[PDB]
Design a protein around this ligand. Structure first.
Ligand SMILES: *[C@@H]1O[C@H](CO)[C@@H](O[C@@H]2O[C@H](CO)[C@@H](O[C@@H]3O[C@H](CO[C@H]4O[C@@H](CO)[C@@H](O)[C@H](O)[C@@H]4O)[C@@H](O)[C@H](O[C@H]4O[C@H](CO)[C@@H](O)[C@H](O)[C@@H]4O)[C@@H]3O[C@@H]3OC[C@@H](O)[C@H](O)[C@H]3O)[C@H](O)[C@H]2NC(C)=O)[C@H](O[C@@H]2O[C@@H](C)[C@@H](O)[C@@H](O)[C@@H]2O)[C@H]1NC(C)=O
Ligand SMILES: *[C@@H]1O[C@H](CO)[C@@H](O[C@@H]2O[C@H](CO)[C@@H](O[C@@H]3O[C@H](CO[C@H]4O[C@@H](CO)[C@@H](O)[C@H](O)[C@@H]4O)[C@@H](O)[C@H](O[C@H]4O[C@H](CO)[C@@H](O)[C@H](O)[C@@H]4O)[C@@H]3O[C@@H]3OC[C@@H](O)[C@H](O)[C@H]3O)[C@H](O)[C@H]2NC(C)=O)[C@H](O[C@@H]2O[C@@H](C)[C@@H](O)[C@@H](O)[C@@H]2O)[C@H]1NC(C)=O
Ligand SMILES: *[C@@H]1O[C@H](CO)[C@@H](O[C@@H]2O[C@H](CO)[C@@H](O[C@@H]3O[C@H](CO)[C@@H](O)[C@H](O)[C@@H]3O[C@@H]3OC[C@@H](O)[C@H](O)[C@H]3O)[C@H](O)[C@H]2NC(C)=O)[C@H](O[C@@H]2O[C@@H](C)[C@@H](O)[C@@H](O)[C@@H]2O)[C@H]1NC(C)=O
Ligand SMILES: *[C@@H]1O[C@H](CO)[C@@H](O[C@@H]2O[C@H](CO)[C@@H](O[C@@H]3O[C@H](CO)[C@@H](O)[C@H](O)[C@@H]3O[C@@H]3OC[C@@H](O)[C@H](O)[C@H]3O)[C@H](O)[C@H]2NC(C)=O)[C@H](O[C@@H]2O[C@@H](C)[C@@H](O)[C@@H](O)[C@@H]2O)[C@H]1NC(C)=O
Ligand SMILES: *[C@@H]1O[C@H](CO)[C@@H](O[C@@H]2O[C@H](CO)[C@@H](O)[C@H](O)[C@H]2NC(C)=O)[C@H](O)[C@H]1NC(C)=O
Ligand SMILES: *[C@@H]1O[C@H](CO)[C@@H](O[C@@H]2O[C@H](CO)[C@@H](O)[C@H](O)[C@H]2NC(C)=O)[C@H](O)[C@H]1NC(C)=O
Ligand code: NAG
Ligand code: NAG
Ligand code: NAG
Ligand code: NAG
Ligand code: NAG
Ligand code: NAG
Ligand code: NAG
Ligand code: NAG
Ligand code: NAG
Ligand code: NAG
Ligand code: NAG
Ligand code: NAG
Ligand code: ASC
Ligand code: ASC
Ligand code: G2F
Ligand code: G2F
Ligand code: ZN
Lengths: 499, 499
């Protein structure tokens, strides 16, 4: 019987009690990254994360930081591979920058051969060290030209441009890459990019945020989500029909959270909690498993929810070989009003739930996850058991999928000095406590989880936060980014992998 | 009789001998700037100078500097107006960033009302202090979307997109702005943007520079130059036919140089010198005054030179109310081969001339203008009399135009400390020596020059050089850009203006 801790102090950092041998022998362990966050702009065209961070610098992060140079993995990709080789990692998730291989967005306008060569060399280097690539085609960095031509994922023109981009990736790299991710965290762009305007492209209703250049927070998240599912599904169909000879697998990436009732004896809070599962996970997993949105979304969202045609439903349903599940935290849910006629209505209000980290009796769900210095009542707290709950739920509700955990990690403050930053025991605690629960759910519930990629390989630009927080298992000095030095967490993870 | 100095030391910095009263009473004196160089990216879309500087950082400048934040005239426009008010300037040349008012390039895609408001407030503030705006519609900062859709000025689609942009500017600002410039320095984008790839967008033949993403240095400069003339002319026609009620004037900006023979008794050098006038100035002034390219260009460039249709010739010919002439230096010309079949052929070789600052007997043309630290044999030297020669030539060859000198200035090294940077006596010498010759040519040749705008109002990002050189008459500290402090040159210029 496996027992895992939920509260500090944790004791799972002792590799005598928890290590890679605790898991099946074929289980993949590694780390993850994304292109905007690590490469720099050298050698690529511009994308909407360059656009957004430069047009709205106070949204890029409190330091106004951006991905212009970051850790310079364009130049130092080899040092990334060396970190992985030090860890004895068997997997690495990275993303291809669309703007590096097709700077003009539309494939017919030409490809960047040097960009293609950059990824060829990375892939070859990973394979030579025994590292399996997990490659994200789209980690939010849409070529700016596409957002300016037709507002990107707001328009159905995105589908064929994304399809032609993916086809190029499969043709150039699919002989070596066998695990593809389509769109990173399906929920995020619709809500943050087109609802709250916290992320690129930065669209929203005028009274939500007067700085947005355009938008409608009540309708656009649904339009964008719908086009994401269609573009994803078109790419999966293309892969499965035209690249089956490569013997690979493809899937979407979901951001997952677990939800618990703010008051577990209050039927209204219990109902809000179930609505949150449907509106947060089911918005995408209903279409992916059944070709339809959840009925509660159909009922609440009404005319603002697009319909799939029979052909589209068939394309979307079953459009995955596996799921990349990212998991960071869990929230308590209580009822909240849904003012659909307010000018500041957002799609996020449709779930009729308010989310917190503290329940009605005052219990904080778990240890600190992210301090909010402007507002401490907005701190985020984590919940190790949530990874168990999420995986169990996906097996039970969503037809026993093959899963890879494609992101899991925690930040530390950018104000810490180097010594403090390297002594990242809070990161060991977070990673180990989640890995304990992950092993427990695999053993107890028989969830088909086959790998785990911790967020992040090294310190990088964090969307919305600049360089004010660090997520790496390896440390990068912003005054001289060449080296990636394993932190205590990286050193721990090395021992966990090879105990 | 007016006597002006050509060599150090200069004595024209004494406002007892040379001041604004030396010129006609209506003569306009001020300074100039451009949007990419001073505003920052906040509040605007992305353009090809953001694209080029980020994709090719070592081409942005030796420090990899760019216009991301620069002197922050987005926030500190008022401080610009305060510099002008301190100088008692009567003119200011600035440019409108296309990407600030139409971030999506094509006007039908929507306008940025806040961007429009930014220029409204600047214009209103200048007029309230008695400063006449001279507004450049296009100072090289093409929206990136247009370069990605159709390669910008390489394609004739540019004409209508530029026309619709200009129409928006005339409609919103033309009730207050009475002096418009269309395209800054017509010669520069074709040659540096599409020939040598020193400037955005960075296209050239593969063997000229392997880093270019695409191009053809032998043909594209001519295509781009042709489209620039057509787009310019379409905008002038639009202005003169639809905005005549505003009672303003419009014209192009030329970069001018004078040319002298490397050996003034050698017929081959003399011929190369006359070819340079035609290929450098006549490339654009032939079309602007006669609707045709110079015959030497027709003969040499052959099938690589586009033809104007009769309708186009008529549109281009006479398409100016005045000329904005920029002037910095003069070169000696000697013959050089034109290897049209070489894979590294460039349009610039078609003139059959090699340019230097030293003549065949070893005479340097004038004082130092720009030190080149990698290569001292590549230093640039200036020649005060060249402004006299250029203005005389334009009056004689080009039908006695109305002229405004829209840029004239000199850099100092960015390595100098603040104290050294403020003690910019070499800038007083450069400005005064040119102003002496300008007054002399107006009096002796009766050239219709009606204003002078010195480059630059304040320190800014310099195309190709980052922040490694300074051109301002006012100093900006890059660690805290709010203030613009008049340097010795600014203080001199203040006394010259109000002696
Ligand atoms: C898995 O996908 C399956 C579909 O492949 C989901 O089942 C479909 O569920 C929908 C409800 O979402 C049912 O559709 C209703 O059909 C009524 C019956 O119509 C049929 O007979 C008529 C009935 O009187 C008739 O007019 C119609 O022409 C057919 O003859 C409808 O009236 C319902 O429409 C009303 O409600 C809609 C909101 O639900 C609203 O948008 C419509 O305007 C209308 O007010 C609905 O009809 C649908 O109307 C919209 C139109 O665009 C659709 O094409 C039309 O079908 C389906 O009949 C049912 N299909 C079958 C094959 O079962 C399944 O839903 C789950 O299971 C069903 C049993 C139900 O309990 C759902 O609540 C639950 O979500 C999806 N599973 C999951 C887990 O999501
Ligand atoms: C100011 O603009 C005026 C035009 O508005 C320029 O004058 C034009 O100059 C061109 C030369 O550039 C002369 O065109 C030549 O016409 C010959 C005569 O053709 C007429 O009679 C025929 C002659 O035998 C006949 O086929 C033709 O159909 C007419 O009947 C031509 O053969 C020349 O073409 C050859 O040379 C071209 C290069 O110059 C080459 O590109 C052609 O392939 C061909 O080999 C030329 O014909 C031109 O051919 C190209 C075609 O696209 C043009 O439409 C076609 O005209 C013009 O006759 C002359 N027009 C008039 C109204 O004078 C003027 O040029 C300056 O002045 C003229 C006198 C000449 O000295 C030029 O060298 C000098 O540049 C421009 N001024 C300035 C200062 O640039
Ligand atoms: C977890 O949720 C439960 C279920 O909602 C909370 O228990 C309920 O708390 C209500 C108070 O918020 C109780 O109602 C009140 O009962 C007192 C005694 O009769 C009465 O004077 C009140 O005016 C009030 O009555 C309601 O008034 C509004 C009407 O619309 C409604 O019909 C009335 O019910 C309610 O009885 C109680 N329900 C149960 C099943 O116990 C629970 O609240 C926490 O426990 C209750 C026992 C009470 O001690 C609360 O003070 C305490 O907050 C909530 N838990 C937390 C920690 O918030
Ligand atoms: C300014 O340009 C002028 C005109 O081109 C230069 O003067 C010319 O310089 C040529 C030498 O580069 C002289 O030709 C030479 O004459 C000597 C004496 O006969 C002879 O031995 C040479 O081999 C050579 O002759 C030429 O050989 C090549 C044949 O294709 C050609 O037909 C021959 O002419 C030429 O006479 C002279 N022309 C004139 C009109 O004086 C001038 O060069 C400078 O001055 C000349 C006098 C001489 O002192 C050069 O050393 C000195 O460089 C050049 N000025 C500068 C400063 O470069
Ligand atoms: C968001 O777009 C929706 C749909 O166009 C707008 O909601 C409509 O508002 C129009 C004008 O009131 C109403 O007539 C419709 O009944 C509403 N339609 C539905 C689908 O709700 C909404 O006003 C726009 N919001 C913003 C802030 O512009
Ligand atoms: C530049 O474009 C020109 C015109 O397309 C190319 O020059 C031609 O080269 C083709 C192939 O040799 C020749 O057949 C033509 O005679 C040339 N045409 C003329 C107008 O010169 C040139 O090769 C291209 N340069 C680059 C480097 O691609
Ligand atoms: C690995 O952890 C398991 C418990 O799952 C333990 O039994 C085994 O000894 C550990 N391996 C090492 C080398 O410490
Ligand atoms: C498959 O590739 C072939 C050849 O390029 C193409 O005709 C077909 O439409 C492609 N399709 C998909 C997504 O099935
Ligand atoms: C608008 O929304 C903000 C946040 O959603 C909320 O605090 C405020 O009450 C809302 N106001 C109206 C008029 O609904
Ligand atoms: C930067 O870091 C690299 C690797 O540690 C080091 O070799 C190089 O000398 C450092 N550069 C400077 C300027 O210190
Ligand atoms: C790498 O991991 C493999 C598989 O578990 C192991 O046998 C090998 O010893 C490890 N290497 C190091 C250097 O840890
Ligand atoms: C201005 O310069 C002129 C010479 O052009 C001189 O005569 C006049 O006195 C000067 N004005 C002042 C105020 O110094
Ligand atoms: C003038 O404006 C009118 C009305 O918008 C338009 O019809 C006409 O084509 C414009 N033209 C130019 C450039 O003359
Ligand atoms: C190519 O050009 C460079 C500069 O134009 C020149 O130095 C070199 O000789 C040229 N080579 C050939 C093969 O023409
Ligand atoms: C920056 O310069 C402005 C103007 O001189 C000054 O008022 C402000 O205090 C300075 N900021 C800092 C941080 O020194
Ligand atoms: C401004 O220039 C005008 C015109 O020459 C002059 O009369 C006025 O005194 C000057 N003001 C200052 C403060 O120099
Ligand atoms: C930050 O930026 C936006 C403009 O992009 C501006 O509307 C807003 O006031 C600024 N936010 C704060 C809190 O300063
Ligand atoms: C600078 O950048 C380009 C890539 O953009 C590269 O080809 C070239 O080698 C670099 N230049 C130098 C001298 O390092
Ligand atoms: O739940 C979530 O976790 C991540 C991030 O907030 C973790 O730092 C994210 O993008 C979500 O929507
Ligand atoms: O002659 C020229 O002067 C300027 C610049 O070099 C002055 O710094 C330029 O853009 C030209 O082509
Ligand atoms: C997963 O979350 C990490 C932590 O916030 C982000 O850096 C990744 O880009 C996101 F995909
Ligand atoms: C005129 O030249 C100045 C000096 O190089 C540049 O800064 C301007 O942008 C150019 F238009
Ligand atoms: Zn930048």
């Amino acid at each position: 019987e496996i027992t895992c801790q939920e509260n500090l102090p944790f004791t799972c950092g002792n590799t005598d009690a928890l290590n890679s041998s605790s898991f099946s022998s074929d289980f993949i362990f590694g780390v993850a990254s994304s292109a905007y966050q690590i490469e720099g702009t050298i050698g690529r065209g511009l994308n909407i994360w360059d656009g957004f961070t430069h047009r709205y610098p106070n949204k890029s992060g409190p330091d106004h930081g951006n991905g212009d140079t970051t850790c310079d993995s364009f130049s130092y990709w080899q040092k990334d591979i060396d970190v992985l080789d030090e860890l004895n990692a068997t997997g690495y998730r990275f993303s291809i920058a669309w703007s590096r291989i097709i700077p003009r967005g539309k494939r017919s306008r030409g490809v960047n051969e040097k960009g293609i060569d950059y990824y060829h060399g990375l892939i070859s280097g990973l394979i030579k060290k025994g590292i399996t690539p997990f490659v994200t085609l789209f980690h939010w960095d849409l070529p700016q030209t596409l957002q300016d031509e037709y507002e990107g994922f707001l328009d159905p023109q995105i589908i064929d441009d994304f399809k032609d981009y993916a086809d190029l990736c499969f043709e150039e790299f699919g002989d070596s890459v066998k695990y593809w991710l389509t769109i990173n965290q399906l929920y995020s762009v619709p809500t943050r990019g087109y609802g709250s305007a916290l992320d690129a492209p930065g669209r929203c209703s005028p009274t939500v945020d007067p700085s947005c250049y355009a938008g409608n927070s009540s309708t656009e998240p649904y339009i964008v989500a719908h086009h994401q599912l269609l573009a994803h599904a078109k790419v999966v169909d293309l892969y499965r029909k035209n690249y089956t000879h490569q013997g690979g697998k493809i899937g979407p990436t979901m951001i997952t959270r677990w939800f618990l009732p703010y008051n577990d004896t209050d039927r209204h809070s219990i109902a809000a909690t179930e609505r949150m599962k449907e509106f947060f996970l089911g918005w995408f997993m209903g279409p992916l498993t059944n070709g339809t949105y959840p009925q509660i979304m159909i009922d609440t969202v009404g005319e603002r929810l697009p319909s799939f045609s029979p052909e589209e439903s068939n394309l979307v349903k079953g459009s995955y070989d596996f799921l990349g599940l990212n998991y960071y935290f869990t929230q308590y849910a209580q009822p909240s009003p849904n003012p659909v006629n307010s000018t500041n209505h957002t799609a996020m209000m449709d779930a009729g739930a308010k989310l917190t980290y503290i329940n009605a009796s005052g219990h904080y769900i778990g240890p600190l996850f992210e301090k909010d210095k402007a507002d401490s009542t907005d701190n985020i707290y984590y919940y190790p058991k949530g990874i168990y709950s999420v995986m169990d739920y996906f097996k039970n509700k969503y037809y026993n999928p093959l899963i890879y955990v494609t992101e899991n990690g925690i930040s530390t403050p950018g104000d810490e000095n180097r010594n403090q930053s390297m002594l990242d025991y809070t990161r060991i605690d977070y990673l180990c406590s989640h890995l304990c629960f992950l092993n427990k759910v695999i053993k107890e519930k028989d969830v088909n989880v086959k790998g785990y990629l911790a967020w992040a390989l090294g310190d990088n630009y964090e969307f919305n936060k600049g360089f004010t927080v660090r997520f790496g298992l390896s440390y990068i000095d912003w005054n001289n980014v060449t080296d990636r030095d394993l932190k205590k967490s990286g050193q721990w993870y090395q021992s966990f992998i090879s105990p």
